[PDB]
Design a protein around this motif. Structure first.
Motif, PDB file in Angstrom:
ATOM      1  N   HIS A  33       0.834  -1.193   0.000  1.00 33.87           N
ATOM      2  CA  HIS A  33       0.000   0.000   0.000  1.00 33.87           C
ATOM      3  C   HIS A  33       0.868   1.242   0.000  1.00 33.87           C
ATOM      4  CE1 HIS A  33      -3.333  -2.579   0.708  1.00 33.87           C
ATOM      5  NE2 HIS A  33      -3.137  -2.750   2.001  1.00 33.87           N
ATOM      6  N   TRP A  34       0.335   2.320  -0.567  1.00 38.20           N
ATOM      7  CA  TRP A  34       1.040   3.595  -0.597  1.00 38.20           C
ATOM      8  C   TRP A  34       0.138   4.742  -0.153  1.00 38.20           C
ATOM      9  CZ3 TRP A  34       6.282   3.656  -2.268  1.00 38.20           C
ATOM     10  CH2 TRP A  34       6.735   2.483  -2.911  1.00 38.20           C
ATOM     11  N   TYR A  35       0.708   5.616   0.672  1.00 37.33           N
ATOM     12  CA  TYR A  35       0.038   6.810   1.188  1.00 37.33           C
ATOM     13  C   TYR A  35       0.843   8.069   0.833  1.00 37.33           C
ATOM     14  CZ  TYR A  35      -1.999   3.054   3.970  1.00 37.33           C
ATOM     15  OH  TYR A  35      -2.611   1.892   4.370  1.00 37.33           O
ATOM     16  N   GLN A  36       0.127   9.159   0.540  1.00 34.38           N
ATOM     17  CA  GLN A  36       0.768  10.452   0.271  1.00 34.38           C
ATOM     18  C   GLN A  36       0.482  11.368   1.445  1.00 34.38           C
ATOM     19  OE1 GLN A  36       0.413  13.351  -3.626  1.00 34.38           O
ATOM     20  NE2 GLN A  36      -1.036  13.790  -1.957  1.00 34.38           N
ATOM     21  N   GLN A  37       1.511  12.069   1.915  1.00 35.25           N
ATOM     22  CA  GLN A  37       1.316  13.099   2.933  1.00 35.25           C
ATOM     23  C   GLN A  37       2.029  14.403   2.567  1.00 35.25           C
ATOM     24  OE1 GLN A  37       1.172  13.259   7.825  1.00 35.25           O
ATOM     25  NE2 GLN A  37       3.025  12.398   6.899  1.00 35.25           N
ATOM     26  N   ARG A  45      -4.800   7.789   1.519  1.00 27.99           N
ATOM     27  CA  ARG A  45      -4.667   6.560   0.724  1.00 27.99           C
ATOM     28  C   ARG A  45      -4.406   6.946  -0.719  1.00 27.99           C
ATOM     29  NH1 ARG A  45      -9.153   1.850  -0.438  1.00 27.99           N
ATOM     30  NH2 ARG A  45     -10.192   3.728  -1.244  1.00 27.99           N
ATOM     31  N   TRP A  46      -3.393   6.329  -1.320  1.00 29.74           N
ATOM     32  CA  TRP A  46      -2.962   6.735  -2.647  1.00 29.74           C
ATOM     33  C   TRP A  46      -3.050   5.575  -3.626  1.00 29.74           C
ATOM     34  CZ3 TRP A  46      -3.420  11.554  -3.264  1.00 29.74           C
ATOM     35  CH2 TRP A  46      -2.888  12.212  -4.388  1.00 29.74           C
TER      36      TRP A  46
ATOM     37  N   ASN B 104      -7.993  -3.594   2.903  1.00 32.45           N
ATOM     38  CA  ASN B 104      -7.271  -3.425   4.167  1.00 32.45           C
ATOM     39  C   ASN B 104      -6.319  -2.221   4.257  1.00 32.45           C
ATOM     40  OD1 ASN B 104      -5.444  -5.009   2.254  1.00 32.45           O
ATOM     41  ND2 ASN B 104      -4.084  -4.537   3.970  1.00 32.45           N
ATOM     42  N   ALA B 105      -6.296  -1.386   3.221  1.00 32.87           N
ATOM     43  CA  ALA B 105      -5.498  -0.156   3.262  1.00 32.87           C
ATOM     44  C   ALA B 105      -6.245   0.847   4.118  1.00 32.87           C
ATOM     45  CB  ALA B 105      -5.317   0.399   1.874  1.00 32.87           C
ATOM     46  N   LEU B 106      -5.506   1.773   4.726  1.00 34.15           N
ATOM     47  CA  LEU B 106      -6.115   2.828   5.540  1.00 34.15           C
ATOM     48  C   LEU B 106      -6.735   3.869   4.621  1.00 34.15           C
ATOM     49  CD1 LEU B 106      -3.176   3.039   8.106  1.00 34.15           C
ATOM     50  CD2 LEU B 106      -5.415   2.029   8.503  1.00 34.15           C
ATOM     51  N   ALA B 107      -8.036   3.712   4.360  1.00 34.12           N
ATOM     52  CA  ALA B 107      -8.750   4.475   3.340  1.00 34.12           C
ATOM     53  C   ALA B 107      -9.257   5.823   3.822  1.00 34.12           C
ATOM     54  CB  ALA B 107      -9.912   3.663   2.787  1.00 34.12           C
ATOM     55  N   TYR B 108      -9.628   5.889   5.096  1.00 36.66           N
ATOM     56  CA  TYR B 108     -10.194   7.115   5.660  1.00 36.66           C
ATOM     57  C   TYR B 108      -9.451   7.458   6.933  1.00 36.66           C
ATOM     58  CZ  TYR B 108     -14.004   5.687   2.543  1.00 36.66           C
ATOM     59  OH  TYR B 108     -14.743   5.304   1.446  1.00 36.66           O
TER      60      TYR B 108
END
Lengths: 209, 228
Positions: A33-37, A45-46, B104-108
């Motif tokens: 999984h990838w996240y942008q901040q 969530r990206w 299961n990704a942190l969506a919110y």
């Protein structure tokens, strides 16, 4: 435990460049999984399940990988892509990578310099702050020096710099010189001198108390 | 619309306990785990644990040594994290998050809650105007701002004209001084033509000290050159 190493830790990319950041696992993992901040806001969530864009994420972003190596790709770098990107996998500990900070590599831009004398309201409280603003410059390296009458100042100012602007890819910097009212009243000329790659010679902004 | 609303910032003494809330709307509360994430500067994101509302079940990052407890009020649709035996190690932004509807990704994510652990008492800022100053001898563009000085702890919020003015705004990261108090500035550049008729107000809120100030920033009455 399974460790995630993001490389490179810091990168800068020209507009329109194809950019790839990697997330390496010390042992095989099955998805990423990838996240942008961006500074001052919650991570977003990206990309999820390795390749799936969250709603609203531009099509220039894609993700892939398998086993010990996963990646996030931007096909054509945009100003708004300047951000920190974290990879994440629930079988890893720590579950988040340490992040890749991505910057936009734009053309050199000279700072616009402003100086602000202390307010009357502040002086009445027994203190004088003088502020020097260096607005909208690139790259981040800048020298700001305060000069009070004949003499360069030391240790009585503090500087703060913004994150890269999401639209024009520049930085801004504030320098605040603080003196007691009694020290402020001992001098006449308050100046800030600014050196930057974008300037042919130093810029001085000044006022008389 | 899935929304997670967290409680406000808190200043806590060492050894105390803090409880943070996460109010959920937009979905069936009992069907998704609530995740808790910790963020400290230069240390990325750390998983604290999770709670499944109405199940009695929670999972914990062992590195928190049992100090983090989670609960959830099913009827209320609110999840809570309590952190005990606080030290400066616990000074951080804390988020709650919900995983994907089908993933299961942190969506919110909640907006985050800044907890500061310190022996020092809260101190409210003084807000000083930064009167408009010209970019060049020619005139045309002016920078103005507010100096938000000598407060503790973080955070402060700053907006302009109640959020109506956003273009050209730069709010700087706070500086921690030798005194142990923070200061920051927020500036904005605007057309010189607007100075005579447009009001500019910086709206400042420092929640920990209950300080809320709206400061009008007026042009100086006099300058030392002929008008542009």
């Amino acid at each position: 435990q399974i460790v995630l190493t993001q490389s490179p830790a810091i990168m800068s990319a020209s507009p329109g460049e194809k950019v790839t950041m990697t997330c390496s696992a010390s042992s095989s993992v099955s998805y990423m999984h990838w996240y942008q901040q961006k500074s001052g806001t919650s991570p977003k969530r990206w990309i999820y399940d390795s390749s799936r864009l969250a709603s609203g994420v531009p099509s220039r972003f894609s993700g892939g990988g398998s086993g010990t190596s996963y990646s996030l790709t931007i096909s054509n770098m945009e100003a708004e892509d300047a951000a920190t990107y974290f990879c994440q996998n629930w079988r890893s500990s720590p579950t988040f990578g340490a992040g890749t900070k991505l910057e936009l590599k734009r053309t050199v831009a000279a700072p616009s310099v402003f100086i602000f004398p202390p307010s009357d309201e502040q002086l009445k409280s027994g203190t004088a702050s003088v502020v020097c603003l260096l607005n909208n410059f690139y790259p981040r390296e800048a020298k700001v020096q305060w000069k009070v009458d004949n003499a360069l100042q030391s240790g009585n100012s503090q500087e703060s710099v913004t994150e890269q602007d999401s639209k024009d890819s520049t930085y801004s910097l504030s320098s605040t010189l603080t003196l007691s009212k009694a020290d402020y009243e001992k001098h006449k000329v308050y100046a800030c001198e600014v050196t930057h790659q974008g300037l042919s010679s130093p810029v001085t902004k000044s006022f008389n108390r | 619309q899935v929304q997670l609303q967290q409680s406000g910032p808190e200043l806590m003494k060492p050894g105390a306990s803090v409880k943070i809330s996460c109010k959920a709307t937009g979905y069936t509360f009992s069907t998704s785990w609530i995740e808790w994430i910790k963020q400290r500067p230069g240390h990325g994101l750390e998983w604290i644990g999770e709670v499944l509302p109405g199940s009695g079940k929670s999972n914990h990052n062992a590195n928190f040594k049992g100090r983090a407890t989670f609960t959830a009020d099913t009827a209320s649709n609110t999840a809570y994290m309590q952190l005990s035996s606080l030290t400066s190690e616990d000074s951080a932004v804390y988020y709650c998050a919900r995983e994907g509807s089908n993933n299961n990704a942190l969506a919110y994510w909640g907006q985050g809650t800044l907890v500061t652990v310190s022996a020092a008492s809260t101190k409210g800022p003084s807000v000083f105007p930064l009167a408009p100053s010209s970019k060049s001898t020619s005139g045309g563009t002016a920078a103005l701002g507010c100096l938000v000085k000598d407060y503790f702890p973080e955070p402060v919020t700053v907006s302009w004209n109640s959020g109506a003015l956003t273009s050209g705004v730069h709010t700087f990261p706070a500086v921690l001084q030798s005194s142990g108090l923070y200061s920051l500035s927020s500036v904005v550049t605007v057309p010189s033509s607007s100075l005579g008729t447009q009001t500019y107000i910086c709206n400042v809120n420092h929640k920990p000290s209950n300080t809320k100030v709206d400061k009008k920033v007026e042009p100086k009455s006099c300058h030392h050159h002929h008008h542009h």
